[PDB]
Design an enzyme around this catalytic site. Structure first.
Site, PDB file in Angstrom:
ATOM      1  NE  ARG B  25      -1.475  -1.606   3.450  1.00  0.00           N
ATOM      2  CZ  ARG B  25      -1.114  -2.692   4.131  1.00  0.00           C
ATOM      3  NH1 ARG B  25      -0.275  -2.633   5.158  1.00  0.00           N
ATOM      4  NH2 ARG B  25      -1.627  -3.849   3.766  1.00  0.00           N
ATOM      5  CD  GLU B  62       6.045  -6.355  20.655  1.00  0.00           C
ATOM      6  OE1 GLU B  62       6.456  -7.377  20.093  1.00  0.00           O
ATOM      7  OE2 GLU B  62       5.594  -5.407  20.043  1.00  0.00           O
ATOM      8  CD1 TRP B  84       3.741  -2.264  20.440  1.00  0.00           C
ATOM      9  CD2 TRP B  84       1.837  -2.425  19.271  1.00  0.00           C
ATOM     10  NE1 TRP B  84       3.636  -3.542  19.983  1.00  0.00           N
ATOM     11  CE2 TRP B  84       2.483  -3.675  19.256  1.00  0.00           C
ATOM     12  CE3 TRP B  84       0.624  -2.284  18.588  1.00  0.00           C
ATOM     13  CZ2 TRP B  84       1.949  -4.792  18.609  1.00  0.00           C
ATOM     14  CZ3 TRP B  84       0.095  -3.387  17.943  1.00  0.00           C
ATOM     15  CH2 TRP B  84       0.746  -4.627  17.958  1.00  0.00           C
ATOM     16  CE1 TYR B 110       0.332 -11.046  17.438  1.00  0.00           C
ATOM     17  CE2 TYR B 110       0.964  -8.727  17.490  1.00  0.00           C
ATOM     18  CZ  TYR B 110       0.799  -9.919  16.794  1.00  0.00           C
ATOM     19  OH  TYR B 110       1.146 -10.036  15.490  1.00  0.00           O
ATOM     20  NE  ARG B 151      -5.153 -33.205  20.687  1.00  0.00           N
ATOM     21  CZ  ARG B 151      -6.287 -33.694  21.158  1.00  0.00           C
ATOM     22  NH1 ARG B 151      -6.769 -33.270  22.312  1.00  0.00           N
ATOM     23  NH2 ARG B 151      -6.923 -34.621  20.470  1.00  0.00           N
ATOM     24  CB  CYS B 170       2.795 -10.160  11.730  1.00  0.00           C
ATOM     25  SG  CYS B 170       2.664  -8.782  10.582  1.00  0.00           S
ATOM     26  NE  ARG B 190      -1.127 -10.797   9.303  1.00  0.00           N
ATOM     27  CZ  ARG B 190      -0.821  -9.740   8.500  1.00  0.00           C
ATOM     28  NH1 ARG B 190      -0.511  -9.965   7.238  1.00  0.00           N
ATOM     29  NH2 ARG B 190      -0.625  -8.528   9.008  1.00  0.00           N
ATOM     30  CG  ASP B 193      10.104  -5.183   7.008  1.00  0.00           C
ATOM     31  OD1 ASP B 193      11.195  -5.491   6.476  1.00  0.00           O
ATOM     32  OD2 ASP B 193       9.863  -4.053   7.455  1.00  0.00           O
ATOM     33  CG  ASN B 201       8.652 -10.465  13.925  1.00  0.00           C
ATOM     34  OD1 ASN B 201       8.570 -10.289  12.724  1.00  0.00           O
ATOM     35  ND2 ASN B 201       8.169  -9.551  14.751  1.00  0.00           N
ATOM     36  CB  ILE B 232      13.434  -7.801   0.775  1.00  0.00           C
ATOM     37  CG1 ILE B 232      14.001  -9.017   1.530  1.00  0.00           C
ATOM     38  CG2 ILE B 232      14.366  -6.616   0.834  1.00  0.00           C
ATOM     39  CD1 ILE B 232      15.244  -9.570   0.897  1.00  0.00           C
TER      40      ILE B 232
HETATM   41  O1  LIG Z   1      -6.667 -34.512   8.890  1.00  0.00           O
HETATM   42  C1  LIG Z   1      -6.048 -35.100   9.771  1.00  0.00           C
HETATM   43  C2  LIG Z   1      -6.543 -35.446  11.073  1.00  0.00           C
HETATM   44  C3  LIG Z   1      -5.745 -36.107  11.923  1.00  0.00           C
HETATM   45  N1  LIG Z   1      -4.457 -36.471  11.604  1.00  0.00           N
HETATM   46  C4  LIG Z   1      -3.657 -37.262  12.582  1.00  0.00           C
HETATM   47  C5  LIG Z   1      -2.590 -36.517  13.375  1.00  0.00           C
HETATM   48  C6  LIG Z   1      -2.565 -37.310  14.682  1.00  0.00           C
HETATM   49  O2  LIG Z   1      -1.855 -38.540  14.532  1.00  0.00           O
HETATM   50  C7  LIG Z   1      -4.045 -37.603  14.889  1.00  0.00           C
HETATM   51  C8  LIG Z   1      -4.814 -36.522  15.622  1.00  0.00           C
HETATM   52  O3  LIG Z   1      -4.572 -36.674  17.050  1.00  0.00           O
HETATM   53  P1  LIG Z   1      -3.844 -35.537  17.958  1.00  0.00           P
HETATM   54  O4  LIG Z   1      -2.674 -34.916  17.166  1.00  0.00           O
HETATM   55  O5  LIG Z   1      -4.929 -34.553  18.306  1.00  0.00           O
HETATM   56  O6  LIG Z   1      -3.310 -36.282  19.195  1.00  0.00           O
HETATM   57  O7  LIG Z   1      -4.570 -37.777  13.551  1.00  0.00           O
HETATM   58  C9  LIG Z   1      -3.922 -36.191  10.352  1.00  0.00           C
HETATM   59  O8  LIG Z   1      -2.789 -36.508   9.993  1.00  0.00           O
HETATM   60  N2  LIG Z   1      -4.758 -35.502   9.513  1.00  0.00           N
HETATM   61  O1  LIG Z   2       5.776  -8.160  14.148  1.00  0.00           O
HETATM   62  C1  LIG Z   2       5.663  -7.746  12.997  1.00  0.00           C
HETATM   63  C2  LIG Z   2       4.650  -6.848  12.499  1.00  0.00           C
HETATM   64  C3  LIG Z   2       4.675  -6.488  11.201  1.00  0.00           C
HETATM   65  N1  LIG Z   2       5.614  -6.973  10.306  1.00  0.00           N
HETATM   66  C4  LIG Z   2       5.625  -6.471   8.907  1.00  0.00           C
HETATM   67  C5  LIG Z   2       5.127  -7.425   7.835  1.00  0.00           C
HETATM   68  C6  LIG Z   2       4.523  -6.459   6.821  1.00  0.00           C
HETATM   69  O2  LIG Z   2       5.565  -5.850   6.062  1.00  0.00           O
HETATM   70  C7  LIG Z   2       3.884  -5.407   7.712  1.00  0.00           C
HETATM   71  C8  LIG Z   2       2.469  -5.708   8.140  1.00  0.00           C
HETATM   72  O3  LIG Z   2       1.562  -5.308   7.083  1.00  0.00           O
HETATM   73  P1  LIG Z   2       0.496  -6.331   6.459  1.00  0.00           P
HETATM   74  O4  LIG Z   2       1.185  -7.672   6.244  1.00  0.00           O
HETATM   75  O5  LIG Z   2      -0.610  -6.348   7.481  1.00  0.00           O
HETATM   76  O6  LIG Z   2       0.037  -5.741   5.111  1.00  0.00           O
HETATM   77  O7  LIG Z   2       4.759  -5.334   8.865  1.00  0.00           O
HETATM   78  C9  LIG Z   2       6.624  -7.826  10.731  1.00  0.00           C
HETATM   79  O8  LIG Z   2       7.494  -8.277  10.003  1.00  0.00           O
HETATM   80  N2  LIG Z   2       6.574  -8.173  12.058  1.00  0.00           N
END
Ligand SMILES: O=c1ccn([C@H]2C[C@H](O)[C@@H](COP(=O)(O)O)O2)c(=O)[nH]1
Ligand SMILES: O=c1ccn([C@H]2C[C@H](O)[C@@H](COP(=O)(O)O)O2)c(=O)[nH]1
Ligand SMILES: [Cl-]
Lengths: 287, 287
Positions: B25, B62, B84, B110, B151, B170, B190, B193, B201, B232
Site C-alpha cells: 500500500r 513488548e 506501538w 496480542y 495441541r 502478523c 503470516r 518484513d 520477531n 524485502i
Molecule cells: O486430517 C487429519 C486429522 C488427523 N491427523 C492425525 C494426526 C494425529 O496422529 C491424529 C490426531 O490426534 P492428535 O494430534 O490430536 O493427538 O490424527 C492427520 O494426519 N490428519
Molecule cells: O511483528 C511484525 C509486524 C509487522 N511486520 C511487517 C510485515 C509487513 O511488512 C507489515 C504488516 O503489514 P500487512 O502484512 O498487514 O500488510 O509489517 C513484521 O514483520 N513483524
C-alpha cells in the site's frame, strides 16, 4: 526436474532416519520431528499421491461437506465416506462427556469454523445463516479485490470452541497468496500422521486451491504444506517401507468440467481426476 | 555446525535471487516469496542477530507487555519502548474510524488474545480476569501435565476481533512441542518484513520459549520460524547487502537470573543477555 511426490517420500525418509521416539495420546508410539515444510507444484498437475491409492472420493466429498458448513457425520456418511463416523458415534461422544448430544453431531468443527467462525454453536441442525464470520467467502472476496493482500487467512483453530469439538482440528490455519496471476496456499497442520493422514491432507488442500483458483480466475500455483508434529506411528513403519520401494508415476491432472461462480455451487460431478493409475492401496492401522 | 544466523541471511539471499516483485500500500514495493521455514537452535545460545543490532529491550518490554494482557500503548511507552505509539494515537485511531476511542487503546491485539481469547473486547482499561481463554497459562499447564500433547497452540488470529484491532496480527499462531525434556516452538508468521521486522520477531519467540521452558523445568529446544509472505522492501535492498557483507559473531546467551514460577512474575531485570557483539545498527526506514 524431480517428481513432486519426492517431497513427501523425502519427509518419510527423514522421519524414519532422524525422527525421535515420542509417545502419543493414543498409546501407539511415534517417530517424531517438530517443524517441517514441503512445496508441491499445482501447475498443470494435481499432487494426488501415486505410490499408493489415495481415497480421492473421500477428499472430494469431505471437502464439499466442509464447504456447506455441515457438522453432521451422517451427512458425509451418506455420500459413501465413513471417515468421521466413529467420532460422531454414541459411545465416543459419551467418551468425551457429550452425553446430551445426538449421534453424528461433531460439534463446531471445520465446516462451522469455515462459514460461521465466532457464532454460538448450538447443534448440528441449527440454522447459522449470517452468524459468525464467513472466512471462506471472505478469502474469496479478498482475492477478487486485493490479491496483494497479506492477510488472506482461514483459521479453524477456535480456542473458545475446542471444548465442544469431537476432535481439535489438525489443519489449524491456511493462508492464500497471489502473484503473477497464480494462487498459492500454505496450510499450517499442527499434527500430521505421515502414513494415513498426510497424503489425504495434501490432496484436500490442493483441491481447495484449484476450487478457489477456478472461481477467482487465477491459475493454481504452489501448495506449501507446513507441519507441527510430523509423526509416523510405530506400526506404519512396515507399510511405509513397502511404499518407499515403489516408483512415483506421473501425477494426475484435475479437470473442472464447467465454469462455476460461487464456491457453494460446486458439486462432486464438476470434478474429474484424469490419468490417475496409482500403485495399490496400503492399509495402515488407524491410531 | 553452521551459525544459526546463516538461516536468516540465506533467506534474505533467496528472496533477493528468487523473490518476485509484488506491490504493497506504501508504494515502496517488495520482493516476495510465499512459504519459508528456518530452524534456530535455542540450546545454550540465544538467536539475537549479530550482523546488525537488534532492539532487545523493545523485544523484552513488548513480550512482558503481552504477557500482562495489556492493549494500551501507553503502558509500553512508559517502559521506554515506543513501537506501538503511532497505532494508538488520536490521528491513527480516527483513520481507522475508532473516533471515540481513548488514545493508547489498540483494541484486542496480542495481549488480549493471549490472555483473554474470545472475551468481548471492552476497552484497554477494563478488567478481564475470568473472561476468555487464558491461552498462555493453558499452554503452560499443558506442558507440565501432558508434554506429549500435539495441541499446544496459542492463536492471536481472531476473525471476530480483526475489525477492531489497530493492526491485524502478523504472528497468527505458535505451537509448542516437548520431547526429551526439550521445549521447541514453531511460529506461523503470516507476513515478514525481512529487514525490519523478522530479526525482532525471532528474538521475541526465542525469548518466549525461554520463559516457558524456565517455568516448566525444560531445556530450550528449537525455534522454528514459518513464514507466509516473506518480503524485502525495495528501500531495504541496499541496507541488506551491507548486512550480507558482515560475518555473524557467536550468538549471545540468555541468563535468567532467578527462579520464577509464574509467567506473570517475570520482570525485565530478571534477564541478562551475555556476550552480545552485534555489528552496528543499520537504519531501515519503516514502510
Ligand atoms: O486430517 C487429519 C486429522 C488427523 N491427523 C492425525 C494426526 C494425529 O496422529 C491424529 C490426531 O490426534 P492428535 O494430534 O490430536 O493427538 O490424527 C492427520 O494426519 N490428519
Ligand atoms: O511483528 C511484525 C509486524 C509487522 N511486520 C511487517 C510485515 C509487513 O511488512 C507489515 C504488516 O503489514 P500487512 O502484512 O498487514 O500488510 O509489517 C513484521 O514483520 N513483524
Ligand atoms: Cl487415503
Amino acid at each position: 526436474p524431480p517428481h513432486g511426490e519426492l517431497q513427501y517420500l523425502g519427509q518419510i525418509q527423514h522421519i524414519l532416519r532422524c525422527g525421535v521416539r515420542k509417545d502419543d495420546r493414543t498409546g501407539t508410539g511415534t517417530l517424531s520431528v517438530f517443524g517441517m515444510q514441503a512445496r508441491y507444484s499445482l501447475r498443470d498437475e494435481f499432487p494426488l499421491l501415486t505410490t499408493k491409492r489415495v481415497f480421492w472420493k473421500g477428499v472430494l466429498e469431505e471437502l464439499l461437506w466442509f464447504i456447506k458448513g455441515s457438522t453432521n457425520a451422517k451427512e458425509l456418511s451418506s455420500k459413501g465416506v465413513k471417515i468421521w463416523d466413529a467420532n460422531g458415534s454414541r459411545d465416543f461422544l459419551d467418551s468425551l462427556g457429550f452425553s446430551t448430544r445426538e449421534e453424528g453431531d461433531l460439534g463446531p468443527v471445520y465446516g462451522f469454523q469455515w462459514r460461521h467462525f465466532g457464532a454460538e454453536y448450538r447443534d448440528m441442525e441449527s440454522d447459522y445463516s449470517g452468524q459468525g464470520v464467513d472466512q471462506l467467502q471472505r478469502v474469496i472476496d479478498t482475492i477478487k479485490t486485493n490479491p496483494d493482500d497479506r492477510r488472506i487467512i482461514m483459521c479453524a483453530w477456535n480456542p473458545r470452541d475446542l471444548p465442544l469439538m469431537a476432535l481439535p482440528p489438525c489443519h489449524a490455519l491456511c493462508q492464500f497468496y497471489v502473484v503473477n496471476s497464480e494462487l498459492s496456499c500454505q496450510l499450517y497442520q499442527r499434527s500430521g500422521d505421515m502414513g494415513l493422514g498426510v497424503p489425504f491432507n495434501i490432496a484436500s488442500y490442493a483441491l481447495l486451491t484449484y476450487m478457489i483458483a477456478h472461481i477467482t480466475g487465477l491459475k493454481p500455483g504452489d501448495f506449501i504444506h507446513t507441519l507441527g508434529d510430523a509423526h509416523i506411528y510405530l506400526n506404519h513403519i512396515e507399510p511405509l517401507k513397502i511404499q518407499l520401494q515403489r516408483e512415483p508415476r506421473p501425477f494426475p491432472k484435475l479437470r473442472i468440467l464447467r465454469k462455476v461462480e460461487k464456491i457453494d455451487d460446486f458439486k462432486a460431478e464438476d470434478f474429474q481426476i484424469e490419468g490417475y493409475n496409482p500403485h495399490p492401496t496400503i492399509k495402515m492401522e488407524m491410531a
